Amino acid sequence: XXXXXXXXXXXXXXXXXXXXXXXXXXXXXXXXXXXXXXXXXXXXXXXXXXXXXXXXXXXXXXXXXXXXXXXXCQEKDVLCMFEAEMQWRRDYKVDQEIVNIIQERLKACQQREGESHRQNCAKELEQFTQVVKAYQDRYXXXXXXXXXXXXXXXXXXXXXXXXXXXXXX
Amino acid sequence: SSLPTTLDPAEYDISSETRKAQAERLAIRSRLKREYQLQYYDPSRRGVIEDPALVRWTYARSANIYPNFRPNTKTSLLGALFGIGPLVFWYYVFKTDRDRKEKLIQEGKLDRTFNISY
Amino acid sequence: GRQGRATFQFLPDEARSLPPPKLTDPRLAFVGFLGYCSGLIDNAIRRRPVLLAGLHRQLLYITSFVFVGYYLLKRQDYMYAVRDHDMFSYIKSHXXXXXXXXXXXXXXXXXXX
Amino acid sequence: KYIIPTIMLMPLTWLSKNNMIWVNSTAHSLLISFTSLLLMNQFGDNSLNFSLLFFSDSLSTPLLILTMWLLPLMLMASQHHLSKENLTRKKLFITMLISLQLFLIMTFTAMELILFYILFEATLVPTLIIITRWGNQTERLNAGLYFLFYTLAGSLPLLVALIYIQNTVGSLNFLMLQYWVQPVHNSWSNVFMWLACMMAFMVKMPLYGLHLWLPKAHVEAPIAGSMVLAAVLLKLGGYGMLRITLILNPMTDFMAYPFIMLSLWGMIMTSSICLRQTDLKSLIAYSSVSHMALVIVAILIQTPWSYMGATALMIAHGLTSSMLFCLANSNYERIHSRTMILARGLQTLLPLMATWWLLASLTNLALPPTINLIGELFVVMSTFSWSNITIILMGVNMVITALYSLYMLIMTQRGKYTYHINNISPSFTRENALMSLHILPLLLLTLNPKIILGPLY
Amino acid sequence: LLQVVRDHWVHVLVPMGFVFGYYLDRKNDEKLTAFRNKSLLYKRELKPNEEVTW
């Protein structure tokens, strides 16, 4: 919900126009298995929900924001860098899972269209190219194992190459 | 590997001096067999016997490293060519692949658009 | 490093007896274990039954290593303090030798792969 | 919390009566192994700190749990052996295994390079005594001499390396302190600085060269096939390579390039020899070279994928190869010669063990994902980003890994055993227990090995 | 009461040894008290209880 893209609206309605035979055997079984064990499992789920009654709140995810970046903290010091290294690592763990959501958005694009797939969508493939390219050039993907000090050097390497290209052109 | 036809009824002496030598083959065979037969058909044995032919077989491969190879001949240097040789062979394979890859990153981009790995 | 304003005869200086001594330290207990260990293998070389349950001259073995070890640790607490004190006083007197550098976000090369 | 229960396992064996011994050493180690799985599995955002540096913490170490798991497993295997020996020597021996595990707890927990190294070399002395005494075969002294000749000549160069780095840059001690790291500028003086740090872990992590350290220690086994599990722990004991390459030298890895190439032929040519050899233990000993060569290939690439595969392989090999040595132990205790050709025939005498032979041999191959496939597949996918040609070399290894397992099976599937009058009794209750306690943790790690392959995963 | 002390003289030492390790490593928290309430990461002004982080 909300974060998931999902389909706009589901169609499909029963026609049953050609022939009689024995109607639709799948629809006849759909009404049969709805009361056979689908109704029994729904009654058992309702009985388990009623038996819960009192439940724990659980305050979900903790905040903890900013605490000064590694770029702001000039000169090497163990007391200052430690909290900056934790801040970068927490962002890197989130940025890994941001890609995974858009990855699952592309998974939804393949199924919910089926026949078209490549010809349609147009937004999910474009959003994937906007994030992955930003992830590849900024958040490691070339800077080996994760390090906060190496990321600042990687950001400076991209900035120096861009400034040399902009001044020439 | 066998070169001509499969050797079984081909090239043999027609009952000459080889017949006396062929009879000697069964004499040594039965000599090792009879001592095996005596140490087999008793119920009070319980345990796998030695058999010195298989003990010396393991000793031929595991040991005999430095008692042998004391004349380090030109054949050992030919074996060394198959030793160090292949290790230096890939040095002109992996480096040529790397210099092909690294030059494609900097000038004339060949990097993948959807490469989040590594 | 080397001795300057310190003299021999009586191992602690007594003039610099300001720092607190080691009281029930884990370092004292490990030498106490060695004092017990010396009271285990004495019944092994000289043939005596059971290293754990034997003759009770082991109380001398425990006390001796604790007694010598206490003054040895007192020498450790003294000498490490003096070595640190002469180090701090050298920076405070000269000042020009020890230079301070602060605030830098210098550019460094980034490694590939 | 892991200091002074293993030290409290020391007086347990001495104080206990002659009728007991084995009942106390195993039961008071299984509950200690329960507490390791209870407490060490917790992680925050990054690496924690349990205490001040006597024993530090865990960053990417579920390998500590494996040693605690083998803490009673070695005592399980050495039951038929050391049953006819002196009761005072039984008390002497178990304490030597405990002392090995004592320093092994220390080395994995301590996040130092100085305290780690001296306790890394403190595992060498107990193993020396364990190999050179109770050795069933002759010339066991060559297995003892070369154990300290190959290792110490490579590891004493760490004293001239590690102290040199801390004299220049701050101190190595706390490791999480060591982020003052300056990039190595690739100079001729820095050439031997990199080599001395690596060569110490080029011996215990067997390459193609300097690899004779391993098979001699296994052929001239410490005890039949029981104390070989400690030598499996020494193979994974070269985990300092994960820490040295990451922290001490990240920039200069041009010298790593020939060492991957040296270990690349330490994959094919080490597997080729492991096809004809007569000793059943040596057919595990040379296969253990190739599976541990995978890590040496992985680490020197330094890509994030390789670390995921390596840390998995350290745990994978520690429970699969050791299980294979337990199968070699069960065959040696009956025949008393480790000849593969002589000991031929399962199911006719050993019906239940044959299924355990399968669950141990096929794990050398990439089965339905246990930890070995998860270990190997990430490394092969990491080598492609390094260079495209690698899978041609790596693919040959995938063929000979089948020539590891099936050749061990076929030479035991051939139903004959004509000369054998022994092996009348199938298996003891503790004998089949070794087969279960090695394989069932691998079977439980099929479901979710998230807490196994974890360097920031 | 009388037979348990002679038969299980060593059987009590190992779990009690764990308790000794459980207590000694816990007491190391007082040695590391610098920036317990300080350093902005999980810092919050506690009122009903003194020293939240150990």
Next chain:
Amino acid sequence: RWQEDPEPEDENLYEKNPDSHGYDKDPAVDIWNMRVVFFFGFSIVLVLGSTFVAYLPDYRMQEWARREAERLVKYREAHGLPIMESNCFDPSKIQLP
């Protein structure tokens, strides 16, 4: 000839005498050792232990980051213009030259 060395020992009982045993010497202690205390470590550390291997130790923010990312996707798409990634750690920092 050695006159002292020739004294070989070969005795593997297994089934002959104790009938049902895991190890030699004392059958009453053997049942209590090979079948009881070995199996209590086989039961507690493997079944009750498995509820600690992967079953609920939280474990390095694996499930925490899912609730963290989902609220950040909706936040920077509705209010912000870039899709959660553009520049890493350094917004207008000190330049190289």
